[PDB]
Structure formats: C-alpha cells, structure tokens
Symmetry: C4
Subunit: 454 residues, 4 copies
C-alpha cells in the first residue's frame, strides 16, 4: 500500500526516471493541446474571411440604397429623417436605386428571386385605421413592383395612391428585395466560388411617433449553389478535407475523457484501500477541468461539423464552445509546469487570501449595488454613462479601477444645479470610499500573511 501511495503521488518524469514508466498520457495531452489550438486558428481564419465578405457587401448595400448615407451608422439604425419630403425622398431613392442596380453596382451583383421565384420589389406600410379619430388595430397592405413596372418610361408606381402616407398614423414602411452575389476573390485559389443570396429589408420605422423616423437596413446572407456560373477552376472538397481533422480532434479528446475518468476511479480505489489501513487529497481538481474541456471541445467540434455540412453562416455557439475549451486547455499547461514545485509561496497566499477577498467582495458588493441604483435613478436622464443599470455597473467598475473618471465628471449637464451638485458628491464619495476600502484591505491581507507563515 505504501509503495502504491508513493507511486500515485509521484510525477510522471520521475516515474520514468525511477520506474521507467513511459508517460504516454503526457504526450497525449500535449497532442490534444496542439490539435485544439490548430483547429481554433483554422476556424478563426475561415470565419474571418466569410464575415469580412458579408460585412463589406452590407456596407456597399447601405451606400447604394440609403439616401445621403454618411458611411457610419448613427446608432442601431443607419440614418434618420425629420421631414415628410425627406422620408419621401429616401423611399423613392431606394426604389430608384434598385431599378438601375446593374448600371450602378461595382461588384458581381444581380437580381434574386423571392419565395415564389419572381424578380421584384415588395413594399409594405402600416397604419392605424381612422375609424385625431384612430383605432388600436393596424392595417397592412403591400404592393409588388416588378422590374417591368419600374422600367416603364412613366414610373407609375410613384403616381399611385399607395404612396400617400398619412405620417400622423404611420407605423413603419418596409422595403424588401433579394440579391445574388458571387465572391470572385476565391477563384484565384482555383477553389470554385460560393454564390450568396442576400435578403435585404429597409425599414422606415416611426413607432416612437416623436417626429423622427429611423431607417434600419438588415442584410441576411446565406450560401447557395452556383447554378448560373462557368469558371475554369476545380470544385471544393476541403469540406471533407477538414471533416477528417475535426473527427481526429474528437477521437483524441474522447480518449483523454476516458483516460482521466479511469485515473479518477483508480484514485478512488486507492483511497478505499488507504481507508482500510487507517480504520479532496485524492481527486485532482486538474482532472475535472480536463474533463470539462474535453466535453466542450467535443460539443464544439460536433457543432462545427454540422455547420460545415449544412453550409451555415452563423458561428456563435460553436465559437464560444471552442474558445472556452482552448482557455481550459491552457490552464492545464499551468498545472503541468507547476510540477517544478518552485511555485509554493504564491499558491499558499492564493489559498490563504481567497476567503478574505471573498468576504471583502461580499461587503464591497452591497455598497456597489446601492451606488449603482442611486446613480441610475439620479444621473440616468443627465449622463450617457448612467442611462441604464448595466451601463452604470460598467462605469462604476471602471471608476473603481481608475478609468475615465475625468470624462465621468465632465459629461454631466449643468442645466440642473441640484443634479450637478449631487453628482459631484456622488462621484467624490464613491471614489474616495472604494480607495479607502481597498486601502484597509491590502494592509490587513499583509498583516495576516505574516501570522500564518511566520
């Protein structure tokens, strides 16, 4: 039993130095680290290319169809108008741009079919029925504008009574159309280009009824088969090319999953044997982390394989899984390196101070929450950094860590002398209090780290 206990606590390198036991587990771990990092890098590069293409196309569309587009979104919406003729001009400009799409576009862009396979432009409007007499119910009417209708020498659609919008009753006007684009940037690699279908919606939203309508542009994009295309170049097989690399990563992490599970079981067996002799110290906390990382890697690889198989363009859950898995993989490198045993005093303090810091954070947290609520309720309407609770929390965290305090002082509005005076008291007290609380903490931590060690 004593021989087994010494062997289980022994480091693999010294296991080979004394017992000549080959540490295949360490090599498997290193291989897993390398494969996970390589897979993450490849996935990141591919996503970078696809996302860059889609965002560039969206920017080009915004420049083409939005009237007087500056080049930067004013907020969550691209642009806004404040006058009836301005809104009319924006709508008519968007419609007229779509008609000459061929003469204007600089890229490989063409007209796309709708759900019922028809090239055209659909515009819908919403109003409260008059029945300022109005009713809560809304009316929705849409008109389909084909390319033939827009091509007519007399536009006609413009003279239609459909466009007489009663802005006082208007809710929103939405313009939707489909476009097909091909990225020739990939043809150089002899890799057959992948056609894209863009579903664009322009929403002239005035739901607020505050005298200003907001123009939203959304461009949903997806990959489609390049039926209408003829290039001297090879097709794509890289799908199956990467399909084996992902499978190998799954197998390697699956092996590491069982291997760590078997080691935990053997540890439990030894503790039972030790307990019989003597009728937390046996469960490595670095094995459960490895198990979690393996599970996350397997899930992320499965999601990536599913995304690649179905030619999906959304990689948010898979990316999160892969990133967390890689982070956990690198903390295991810390574990292995620490085998040197020249890391002790630091580890000790990290265990001694953890309860004290956790107690301090619980106390400081209640002051922080109250300050958050007070700041949001008082400086909410007068400060841009205090508009909502989450923003208040982030601003207070930054202030606690020494960031952007002068901007916080400056961006207040002196239009209200009562609020301005309170803000100075609010900001000065908060910064002074948390500096002092962090002061009283370090000194205590130090005084106690001497009692425990000396």
């Amino acid at each position: 039993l004593r021989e087994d206990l010494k062997f289980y606590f022994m480091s693999p390198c010294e296991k080979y130095r004394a017992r000549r036991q080959i540490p295949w587990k360490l090599g498997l771990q290193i291989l897993k680290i390398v494969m996970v990092t390589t897979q993450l890098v490849r996935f990141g590069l591919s996503n970078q290319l696809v996302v860059a293409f889609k965002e560039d196309n969206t920017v080009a569309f915004k420049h083409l169809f939005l009237k007087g587009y500056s080049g930067t979104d004013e907020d969550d919406y691209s642009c806004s108008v404040y006058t009836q003729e301005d809104a009319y001009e924006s709508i008519f400009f968007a419609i007229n741009q779509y008609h000459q799409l061929k003469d204007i576009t600089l890229g490989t862009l063409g007209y796309g079919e709708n759900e019922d396979n028809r090239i055209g432009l659909k515009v819908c409007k919403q109003h409260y029925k008059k029945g300022l007499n109005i009713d809560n119910d809304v009316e929705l009417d849409c008109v389909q504008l084909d390319l033939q209708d827009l091509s007519k020498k007399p536009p006609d659609w413009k003279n239609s009574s459909f466009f007489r919008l009663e802005f006082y009753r208007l809710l929103q006007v939405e313009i939707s159309f489909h476009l097909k684009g091909i990225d020739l940037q990939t043809i150089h690699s002899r890799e057959l280009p992948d056609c894209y279908v863009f579903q664009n919606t322009i929403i002239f939203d005035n739901k607020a009824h505050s005298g200003k309508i907001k123009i939203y542009f959304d461009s949903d994009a997806k990959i489609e088969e390049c039926k209408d295309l003829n290039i001297f170049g090879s097709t794509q097989k890289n799908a199956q090319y990467v399909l084996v690399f992902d499978a190998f990563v799954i197998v390697i992490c699956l092996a590491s999953l069982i291997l760590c599970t078997r080691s935990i079981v053997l540890a439990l067996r030894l503790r039972k044997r030790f307990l019989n002799f003597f009728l937390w110290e046996f469960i490595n906390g670095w094995y459960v982390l490895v198990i979690i990382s393996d599970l996350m890697t397997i899930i992320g690889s499965i999601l990536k394989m599913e995304i690649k198989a179905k030619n999906l363009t959304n990689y948010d859950l898979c990316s999160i899984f892969l990133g967390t898995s890689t982070l956990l993989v690198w903390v295991g490198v810390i574990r292995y390196l620490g085998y040197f045993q020249a890391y002790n005093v630091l580890i000790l303090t990290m265990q001694a101070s953890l309860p004290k810091v956790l107690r301090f954070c619980a106390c400081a947290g209640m002051i922080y929450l109250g300050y958050t609520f007070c700041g949001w309720i008082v400086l909410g309407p007068y400060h841009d950094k205090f508009e909502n609770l989450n923003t208040v929390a982030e601003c207070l965290f930054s202030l606690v860590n020494g960031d952007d305090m002068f901007a916080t002082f400056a961006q207040i509005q002196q239009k209200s002398i009562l609020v301005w005076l309170f803000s100075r008291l609010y900001l000065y007290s908060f910064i002074s209090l948390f500096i002092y609380m962090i002061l009283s903490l370090f000194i205590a931590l130090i005084t106690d780290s001497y009692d425990t060690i000396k």
Copy 2:
C-alpha cells in the same frame, strides 16, 4: 441584569436557536429592502419613458426650426451665426417653418394656443435706445403673427419695418410659440395616450456683442387632458394602481421607524440599569442609518405621490431622495451579513487607519488647494481643463488617480513660451509630489498596523 445584557448583544438567529424568539424585525427589514428596490425600479422605468419622449420631441423641434442644424448642440446653445444675413436667414427660416408645420412634421403635432387662447407667433426684440450715441435703458417691442398673417400670399411680416434690426444695438431676438403633441406609442397598451403641450422659445442672443450671436432652443413640456382625441381604448387608472404601492412602502418604513426608535429606547434603559450596577457601546450606529433611510424613503414617496397626483413632469428632488434611501438600505445589508464575525481584521484596520488617513487628507488637501489656485490663475486662459476652479479641482483629482495626464500635457498652447515652460514644471512637480506623499503614507500605515496588532 447579566441575562438581559447577554440577550441584547445576542444575534437574532441565535436568539431563535436558543430562546426561540421569532425575528420578525429581520423579516420586516428584508421586506422593506425588497419594496424600496422595486419602487425605485418602477419609478426609473416610468421616468425613462417620459424623458425619452420629451428629448426626442426636442431634437425633432431643433431639426425643424433651426436653420442648418448639425444634429449636435455646439455647447449650451444649439447653433451660432457670424453674419447679419445669416441671422436674418435663421430668423426667417424659423418663422417660415412654423407656417407649414403641418406639411413638414412627421409626428402627431399640431398648433397650440397661447395664454389668451390664440394660435400665433410672437417675436420680441431688445435694443438700447439711440438717445455711437446709445443709453443703458433697453426698449422691448413685440408683434403677434397669426396663422392668417403668415398664410397671406404676400408674407407682409417680412416687409415690415419691425425686422430692420440694428445689430450694433441689438441685445436679443426671441421667438415663442405653442405646440400640442400626442404620443401614440402608448395606445398599443390600450392605455389612453396623454397629450403634451410644448412651449418653445428660440432666443437669438448677442448679449456678448463679440460678433457672434448664440441661438438657444428651449422646449418646456407639460401633460394636458386629451380633449381633442378619439381612440378605441381604455383610460388610465394606474395612477391609483401605484398610489397603493407607495402607501404600503410608507407604512412599512413608518413601522421600521418606530421599531428602531423603540429598540434605541430599550438600549438606553439597559444602560441605565447597567450603570446602577457599576456605581456608544449601546447605540447601534446601524440604527441611526436605518432611521435616516426611513425618513428619506418617506419623504421621497410623498414627493412621488404628489408628482403623480398633479401630473408633474419634473422628478429631481424625489429621485435624489429615493436613490439616497436605496443606497442607505443596501449598507444595512452589509451590517446584517457582517453578523458572520469572520470580517474582523478588515474592520480593525478600518478603525485604526481612519485617523491616520484623515490626518493625511488634511495635509494633502492644503497642497491640493494651492495647486488648484495656481493652475487656475496660470493655465486658465491656455488650457481647457483649467478654465474655472471646479474644472481645475476635477482635473487635479483625476491626475492624482492616474487619469488623462498625457492629454493634460498635450492640450496646452505653445504660443507662449513662458506659460508652456511653467506648465511642464507645474504638471511634473504635482504628479511627482502626490505620488511620493501617497508612497510615504502606505509604508507608514503598514509599519503601524504591525505595532497595533503584533
């Protein structure tokens, strides 16, 4: 007496564990915390909606009536002109916009009556009477421009001699009108919309006589009864809906007010009994804080009820009261949590260091004040962060805490070599001195925290 003293110092949880005394006071406190937080959140959301509507309407008005409005206020004033024809253009543009208000506005906006119930536009001008011969007295003359006068094919008002402004004598020109607006964004909730009355004043202020006039736009808004309105929807009763919740909050805090007062009296009775036996340690400093929070909550709730009853749109004192009350409520959570007694070393340092830090702040404060005065007097005309004493104080506080020093160095003007050289000496000495003073402080605090504990 000894039994009573042990009971008064005993924690409520252990009181129930040993004496089986139900801690209804703790439950009442928790209930009060929950109600106060909920009330604050509801008030904040309602104020957010109302303030957002009013600010959006103000922005729309600024875009409509101010000529060549960029979209952002140049300062406390919205825009400014430097030429006589520019000022004439701005005034005439504002007047002409008001005439076609219906054809231009995108929201539910209509003309409003003035004090004497008349739809029109009033413009007033101020001049020093010539009597560069001029006098200190000013003359004020106003002309009322009805919609009929503006509707005339020949404007007329423009050809009037009233508009011949002698800019060399001009003080200001003010344009005032009334508008009525309805927010239909609330009709979806079946809640009858609340009509708004906007009092707008456009001031072309050239009081400085510095070759530049400043254009101010102010939009005072208030809620009015929707007489001219017909919507299939229910009226509002939420007034009385919230009127009971505020009353319950008042009752709960009123109960906590007497309960803490009774506890203090009982503590005083026990100290008198203790003093008779033995012919600060008895007044919880966490009871006076609770009493203050209760008073602030009661005052804020009364103010909120008054504001809701009279349909007022200004919530600055009530918001301050509620925020401070919530902050004080959350420090009581610290008090209760601290019952664990595993918080000691920190509390000790916080009492030992308080006199030392207060002494240090008194010394550092006198250097800080002198540096503030010197910076304001020297770098006042050459630095934007040193224009006035309050700004100097805020800038120096930020510099003491490591914020925006490079910007402070850069935003000086090298047009004066004497001031530029002084600023480098001023900034370098200030930062170095306060770093050293904070250095000499931490080391002292630490050396003494050992003498007191060890």
Copy 3:
C-alpha cells in the same frame, strides 16, 4: 538660557496658554493668506472677462475673413489651400469681406486708422528675384488699398498686375488692417465701456514650398480711449479702487517679510548663546518659504499695479508670480496645522525614504533618457507621440504612470514591418522594466522602514 530655549521651541497657542503672549504673528499670517487668496480670485475673474472678449472677437474675425473656415484651427495655422485658384479665392475673399465690413459684422465693429492715421488695406508679397533661374535675395512690394479704391464699381485692384503671383517663387502674402471695437456688455454695470483696437494680419505662408500654403490669422488687441462714444453712464474709478487693495497686500507682506527676518535673527542670537554654554535645528525651513512667498507676492502685486496703470492686456509673468505665491502660502497652512504633532510617523518616512527615492530616480532616469532617445530616433517619423524629444518624454512618463498605452500601441504604422516589430519590443520592454523597477523599490522601502523604526 534654558527658559529662553523652552520658550523659542514652544507653540504660540501654548505661549498664550502659559505666558499669555498674544500671537499677533499668527493673526498677521492668517490675514495675509486671506488677502492673497482674495487678490488672486479678483485678478483671475478680471482676466477671464478680458481674455474671453478678445478670444470671441478673434473667432468672429476668423469666421468673417477666412474663406471656408470650419470653426476650428487646423493646427498652428487656421486653414490651408493646395491649389492656385484656391489661394486666389482666399485672398480676394478676404479683401472683399473688409470692404463690406459694415454690412456683414454683427458686433460694434468699425474701421481703424493705421500708423499714419489712414483707413485702408495693406497687402505685401515676397518673391525670390528671377535674376528655374532664381536668387537667394527676396523682393518686398506693398500696395495700399483705401476704402475709396475698393468702393469703385470696377474693383480695379483685382485687375492690377500686382496680384499676378508666381507661386513657384512666392514666399508669403500678408494682409494687414486695423479695426476698432467696443464691448457694450459692460455698459449694464454703468461702467463706461473700454474701446479696443484690433491689429489683424492674414499671412498666406508657403515658406515650405511643399505644395501647400498655410493661412495664419493673428489679432493683436489693445485698449484705447473711447473718444468716439456717447453713453448715459459713469466713468471708471475702479482702477484706484483696486489700487488701494494691492497696496495693502504689499504692506501686509512687507510686514511679514521683516517679522520673519527678525525671528531668524533672534534664533541666531539664541544659538550663539547656546554655543557659549556648550563650549539647522534653529533656522525654521518654514521661514525661508514664507520669505520667498512674500517676495513673490510683492513682485506680482507691483507687476499687477503697473499693468493696471498702463492699461496693458498681457498678464503672464504677474499671473505666474501670484500663483506661485499662493501655492507657497498654502504650504504654510500645512506647517501651522502640523502643530498638532499627531503627524509624526508620516514625516519620519518622508525623511527616511527621500534619499532612497532620490537614488532610485537617478538610476531610473538614465534608463528613461536612453529610452527617450531611442524612441525619438526610431518611432519619430511613424508615431505622432514620438515626433520630438519633449513629446517622447511626456509619452514615456504617461506610460510609466499607466496612461494611454493601448493608444500608443495602436497609433503605429504597419507600412514598415521592421519598425512595427521594433515598436512592440520597445513598448513591451519599457513597460515591463519600469513596472519591475517600481516593484523592487516598494519592497525595499518597506523592508528598510522596519529596520529604522523597529
């Protein structure tokens, strides 16, 4: 002798408590502090008003005379042009603005006479004589354009051969004129307004010969007697009103100068008497500071009196003197407050650590200088924060104190891979090294502060 020594070391408050000696010196010091602070505040407010008026007039002039002025100076120069017709347009626009000055200006502005008392416009140009054949010598020719010449229906001046500028030889074109302005903002206070004379020069400088000319606008302003003015209002006597307050400040500081000098002499007498008994500890270092502050205050008050007497508009040396004097006055408040004697441990560390910090700064300074030189020589042409040595020093100081490091990393140009790679090594090494050096310092300071006290 022992009685005298105890008396000289005794605090004034205890002197009155025991010997009943009235501390008139302390009262005189407090009075001096109050008077100095009040004088500084008054001077600052007056300078603020005058400077604000002059800067507003300069901004108005820039808007009036500079063609296409944005509202903010592009650098040390207001605007710039890159095309010959643009330069011609700017020059002609400036000249034409001056002609209609009356119809355009919004302030009380009129034409001013030149040195020889003549209303007109002088424009000078510089060229290298052709003698690309050219010579180092320059030619200067100027033409005077009176208001009569500009008023002519056919401008004429424009058709003159004087304006045929050979840009390839041009050095600069300068336009100078005089204007007279009155600030009526002061007439409200019944204080007679002070007339101003503006000397404006517009320089079209192309000295660099780099394809871009820089347009400089300078507006020298000075106060003149309001001969052409008639307002129902009183004249100014506040000159003599403040002339007594400054005289009283001089007398008070003169008294404090001799009083501290007499105290030092008495201290020297006591040390000589002490030395005879026993055949730095006697010279308060808080008396030489008071003497320096008194001298600075006297000099600043004399300069302020001279400036007020001669109606000067430049207050840079006097402001510096007054600010430094006020700063030194407030450090004496620290001295007096410290009489409490509860400040000891801090003072001790401040004396123990001073040699150690001075030694550390000498070492860190040599690394800092070398890093400054390397950064200026390498990242000089590729980084805006490393253009010149002073900017490099300020940037490195800010980096040492944790400020704007991410901006420092980002604002480099990747056009050169060699410089970009070096910058990462340069920035990473500098930040890491100085963090470690400050680390090794605090620990040493602390270890030694124990040896000296314990």
Copy 4:
C-alpha cells in the same frame, strides 16, 4: 596576488586617490557617450527635415489628384467609391489634374521623365478574360498618354474604348506618372537645393469584389542631381563635413571595443592566478553590454555613412541600430553612478525577486494566452479591439495595466445576445483574475523579502 586582487576590485576614483592611476578609460567612456548622443541628435534632425518634406509633398499630391479627398486617409487606402460613375469620375479627374499640373500646383513641381525618358501618363487595367463565363487567367493592357494627346482640344483618350471597364470582371486600374520637385526651403542657408523625383502610382483596387473599390496613392521619392537649376548659392560639402564626425565615432568605439576586451582578458588571467592559489565574479556583465553597444554603434555608423554617400532616403535599420546603441550607452551611466554603493537594498531585491517574478510570469502567461485565443475566436467579428491575435494581446495587456476598460465594455455589439452575455463574463473574469493574481504575488514577494534579509 592579494595586492592585484584588491587593485582589480578597486574603483578608478580611489585608484587615483591611492595609486595615482589616471582613469583614461573613464574619460574615453564619457567622450564616447557624448559623441554617440550628438551623432544621434544630428541624424534625427536631418531625417526629420527630409521626412517632413516628403510627407508634405505626398499630402499635396493626394489633395491634387484624388477626387473629393477629405484630408485624412480612410485607412490603408486614401479614399473609396461605391458606384461605377464615381469610379469613372475619380479616374478621369486624376487624368485631367495631371494635364493642367502647371496651372494648379502651388509648389516648384514639374513633369518628370519615365524609364525611357518620355513625359506621359501610363494607365493599366486587369480583367479576367470572359472565355458569368470567366477564367482564372488575367489580361493586362496599358496605354501611354503623352502630354500632346491630353492637350488635344478633343480629349480623345476619354472616348477611347480602352476606358469601357467591365467592373464585374475588373481587378484593378493603376495610373502611374513621374514628377520632379525642388525644395527651395534650403536655399536660404546658401546650401544648393537637392532635386527630388516622385514616382506616383494611383491604384483603383477592387480585388475584394465586395461592391467597393479602394483607392491607394503611393509616392516613392528619391534625390537626383539638379541639372535644370540656376541659383546664386554655394554647393554642398556637408557630406564630407559629417563624414569625418562619423569616422571619429567609429574610431572611439573601436578603441573602447579593444579596451574592454583587453580588460576581460586580464580578468581571466587573474582568475587563473587565483585558481592556482586555491588548488561570474570576474567577468563584469557591464563589459559585454559595452561591447554590444560598441558593435551596434559601429554598424549603425557604417550604415549611415553608406546612406549619406549614396544619397539614400530610407533610414530604418541604421536608426534602429543607433537607437539601441544609445540606450545601451545610457545603461552604462547607471553602472558608473552605482559606484557610490548606496544602492544596495534595491539591487538585492532585484536579484531575489527576479526568479519569483519569472516564475509568476510563466504561470500568468499561459492564462493570458488562453484568454487571448478565446477573445479572438469569440469577440473577433464583434469587437474592433479583438479583430486579430496581436490586437487581442495588446488589448489584454492594456486591460491588465488598467487602461481603456470602459471602452472595451462599450464597443461591443448587442445585436447578438449570446455574444454580448459572454463578453461580460469574459471581461469581468479576466480583470478580476489578474488583479487577484497580482494581489497574491505582492504579498508573497513581501513575506519572502523578510525571510531573506531578516
């Protein structure tokens, strides 16, 4: 042997104080420091002048030839267009500007000859041959436009079929021309001006095929003999003027190279003699640094001499060498100053803490790398500070040092609720973890610095 050992450990000043040995080595070192610093300053000033001239000319060219140039590069490219007619307008505007170059330019600029000595304009275009039928191969065709062709009353070139660009197949359009410029700013110093030849290329690059073409402007400049120039002024000899100063610097550092090498050999001889008596402490680590600095200075001086001899305009390797040499020279000043021996406690900690900090950095580095990878993979497409791995590393380093955290929180896109929630967890955990790890480090360092010294 004991006498020799005491002499070798003895400081030069005390060597002269006792043995009267003149420290010519110290004087040689000081001379070397002075010469190196002077050479660096001179080189920096000359490079500043040349670089400023070239950059100003490039800015002028961008303003002249790029249509609608704002004044600041939108990125790595100067400007961009999104419409076919916009691209046509930009190309035609560039060509038309070149034709009237003389009437437009404000500087001494003239037409330059191409490789075959011909004044003209070359424009090349790239397309995939149609053979959306297209092929991977590209076609390149160029047309030479002489000044005579552009001068024709009927432009002609514009009506040519060459300009019919099929944007759907276009790769890029490049316009190249040569210009000759002279800087007359130097003629004042009587120093003959140096003529410059500018090779400018305008690239209308649409390689991305994303609906937006990017316009690149590159201006390669080099010095040429001023054949076409006649100024009354002297030629340049400063080449040989500085050629001796650089030679002297080389000789001085060459002498210091052998002198330090000889000292090391003598140290090795003494250690061998010491070893025979007793049958790291002898190799100054401040001699190898001096040797490295000498080698770097010699290499940099040789490179500078080569650059000056061949009139080259690129100074990036030489500048790096000189800067590193100067930095190493200033660390030797630290070495000499340290002879005072009042620097001990600091040096001690710097040796005691180095292993502990190196161990801590190895551990913190693995967490930092994992966080870098996770941030790049997750927040890559949604945050501008996480676009690529290097940017992620710089952002995380800045966050570790307290910089721009609030901006990091704010610049995320809430369009994805999953990514937004992860970012808050990602940022909060990273900042909290590294603060705690740095916390647990300082306390450990301090506890151990007591064990080693006390």
